[PDB]
Amino acid sequence: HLEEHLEKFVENIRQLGIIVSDFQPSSQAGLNQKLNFIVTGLQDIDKCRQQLHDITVPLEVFEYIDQGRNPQLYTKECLERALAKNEQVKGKIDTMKKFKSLLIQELSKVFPEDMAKYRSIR
Amino acid sequence: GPFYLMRELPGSTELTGSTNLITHYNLEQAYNKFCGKKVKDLPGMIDLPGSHLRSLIEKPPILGTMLAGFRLHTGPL
Amino acid sequence: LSRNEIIQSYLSRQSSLLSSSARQLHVLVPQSPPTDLPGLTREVTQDDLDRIQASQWPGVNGCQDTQGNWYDWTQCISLDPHGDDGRLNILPYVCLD
Amino acid sequence: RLTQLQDAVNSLADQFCNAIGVLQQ
Amino acid sequence: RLSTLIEFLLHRAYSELMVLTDLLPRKSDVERKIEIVQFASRTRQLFVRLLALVKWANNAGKVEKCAMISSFLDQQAILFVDTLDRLASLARDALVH
């Protein structure tokens, strides 16, 4: 909340400094100076506000963010891959169950004793 | 128990491959939003919000105000 | 250990089937409650010794089979338990050269 | 005969192991 | 937490860039200190964009770890099936012995 607002203010100050550097010395150099000082003070205040919390950095999430993609792009692809994997193992298990049922029917046709005990097992 | 043989039936369980994480954790909405976004990026939003270094930022993430104001001189050219 | 190639899998079926292999199946042998020494304490009944040497004893001297053909221990029995062309061939129990 | 019986028992397992392996694969 | 540490590191990098811009404007030329300040400002803007992306990643959808755990469980089940097959293999190795 407040940290996002501070980051947005820092981005706006960066844009203003870039515009002042690009335009002309006419733009008050003291104005950009005070802007940079306020930006440093706000960065220190944001560090103080965010100095004891969370702790869960360990992921390629940074590579996906720096890989010209958001969490819905690379994260979406990862979630789709996980969904494909989970759907595939379910198909595996279902086909295994079907083959087992087929062989159970065949072994019941083979021996009544086996049918009688497949029934005790069930 | 004269028959012998005859071992234990497993007993039904809820953890199966059946339920996709879409249904298992009720993320069925996250997958739908992902498909919608794929049918429709962060770099695009950044280039739209601004005019248009990444390695230095990643490395940084992995790791007298009056005098500063006056020191302005000898620049802006 | 991946295997699973259609060719690799097909080799497995032929090799396994070869080692293993209308009933034409051996006559069901009813269990005998008294055995020649412990069960019937019959000890040696000369009759038992005479029967083993020349008479047909269903399990002491041979395997009866169905269709009536009698196969002695030395002989090899060819039988067809499944309803298919392939026939289980049972090799001789004694195999005395 | 008895060696054939032992090999047949071992193969009965061979087709179980192989069946389950194929399934997981 | 981690975002707070990232913001503190970004502030330290901004202070270092300000010191470098001071040194450049001091020993740097008029058309050099301005360029160095513009480069430091671009770096600070990139760091702020990276912080915004980190916030968007900490937010948005919070199920990534859930999907990763589900995939890990599926992989563990597959590994258990493979271990069962290898156990059958060692059992049959003992069967020939």
Residues 6+ apart with CB under 8 A from A53: E1, E2, E3, E4
B46 in contact with A, Cβ within 8 Å: no
Task: From chain D, pick out residues whose CB is under 8 angstroms from the CB of C4.
Answer: 22, 25
C-alpha E12, offset from chain centre: 19
Q: Do chains B and D touch (3 or more CB pairs under 8 A)?
A: no
Domains in chain A: how many in total?
1
C-alpha C31, offset from chain centre: 16
- The structure tokens listed for E76 are 């563990």
Method: cryo-EM
Residue in B24, B56, B77 closest to E34 by CB = B77
D9 in contact with C, Cβ within 8 Å: no
Q: CB D18 to CB C12 under 8 A?
A: yes
Q: Are strands C71-72 and C62-63 parallel, antiparallel or unpaired?
A: antiparallel
- What is the span of the domain harbouring residue A92? 1-122
Residue in C4, C90, C92 closest to D22 by CB = C4
Q: Rounded to 5 degrees, what are φ and ψ at C79?
A: -140, 160
Residues 6+ apart with CB under 8 A from C14: none
How many angstroms separate the CA atoms of B23 and B64, rounded? Answer: 59
Q: Rounded to 5 degrees, what are φ and ψ at C77?
A: -95, 130
D4 in contact with A, Cβ within 8 Å: no
In terms of Cα–Cα distance, which of C12, C15, C10, C17 is closest to C88? C17
Q: CB E63 to CB B42 under 8 A?
A: no
Collapsing DSSP to helix, strand or coil, C72 comes out as: strand
**C40-45 long-range contacts, Cβ below 8 Å, gap at least 24?**
none
Tallying the residues shown for chain B, one arrives at 77
How many angstroms separate the CA atoms of C26 and C65, rounded? Answer: 4
CA dist C44 → A4, A121, C39, C52, E5 (Å) = 103, 47, 12, 12, 97
Residue of chain E nearest D6, judged by CA positions: E96
* Chain D nearest CA to C37, separation (Å): 24
Contact A74, E53 (CB under 8 A): no
Q: CB A99 to CB D24 under 8 A?
A: no
- The resolution, in Å, is 4.1
Please, how many CA atoms are within 13 Å of residue B65, restricted to the half-sphere of its CB?
Answer: 11
Neighbours of A71 (CB within 10 A): 23
How many angstroms separate the CA atoms of E95 and E89, rounded? Answer: 10
D6 in contact with C, Cβ within 8 Å: no
* Chain B nearest CA to A70, separation (Å): 5
